[PDB]
Design a protein around this ligand. Sequence first.
Ligand code: HEM
Length: 338
Amino acid sequence: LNDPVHYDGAWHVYKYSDVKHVLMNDKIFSSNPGNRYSGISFITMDNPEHKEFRDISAPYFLPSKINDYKDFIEETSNDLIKNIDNKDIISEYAVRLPVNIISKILGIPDSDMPLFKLWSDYIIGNKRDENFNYVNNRMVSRLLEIFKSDSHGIINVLAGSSLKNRKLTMDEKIKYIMLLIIGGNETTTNLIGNMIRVIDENPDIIDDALKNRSGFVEETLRYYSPIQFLPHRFAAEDSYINNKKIKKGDQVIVYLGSANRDETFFDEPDLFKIGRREMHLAFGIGIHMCLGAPLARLEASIALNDILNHFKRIKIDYKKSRLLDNKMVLGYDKLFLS
Ligand code: HEM
């Protein structure tokens, strides 16, 4: 891999130790600009205000609390995989799974599920229409009603929340929920398609995958990282990487996929090996390390198990399947088997 280069108004950072240095130094490399370049809610906040925001939901994302959702995710995954044969695995299984799970965790009522899913599609970007304005207005309306009833989910927690000498705004509550929906959907959908791609490419991996689902999910994260780069870091003060001065104000783009293929940290980076020792950076690292990582881990793990037990043979049909076009992420636009 390359030392940091500057072009198109940003530094590009590729090496694993440099990606990590940047992400671990939140006070040197900030998460929001000096102004306007557009990330919502606490993802774009710096360390102090950010912790206040993240703590509101942090306890409910511990692998401990998340695990109470295991039977629900199994039930859901099974319902959708039952009868998927011959269909688009992305739109009929991989998109639908994370959106069901997240509505359960949020506390979206049963009777609001159809509209939540339409709104969710618009908002993560899976849909674009005239209907947007209408559907957003309809969903936000329901949202306000839910905030004032109660459940055990996040909506209810955001209702009873403040942090440090100040109540949460209603725009903050919506954006908070929006950040959960947007950061957990496409990424989980992309991972599911990327695990299917590993299987397609390494057909005798299957037995080992079954014996260590976690391990297989970890190596996919490393090897076909759903998120390829994070474009939004800005130097809060001058500092040096590989003897280059990164000046205050400079945008710093950090490449996770590329860092996850660094031969300095991974022996034989271009091979798929379950049970590697070093941590991958697919979920980032530091104070912004993925809030949904335990949930994502548990969803992928059940998805793998279910996909592996449903099909005998897994060949991707490349005359109908296509990779997404966006360079920032990695996944299938559509995926058809066999
Ligand atoms: C396989 C799935 C995922 C991958 C590869 C992924 C990747 C990431 C990365 C790289 C970051 C850090 C961005 C930064 O440092 O600026 C992040 C943050 C975040 N993710 Fe995930 N993510 C995934 C799934 C999920 C899920 C299921 C959720 C649940 C709603 C979720 C919610 C969040 C939130 C709220 C943040 C920001 C945390 C903070 O800024 O403190 N993600 N994710």
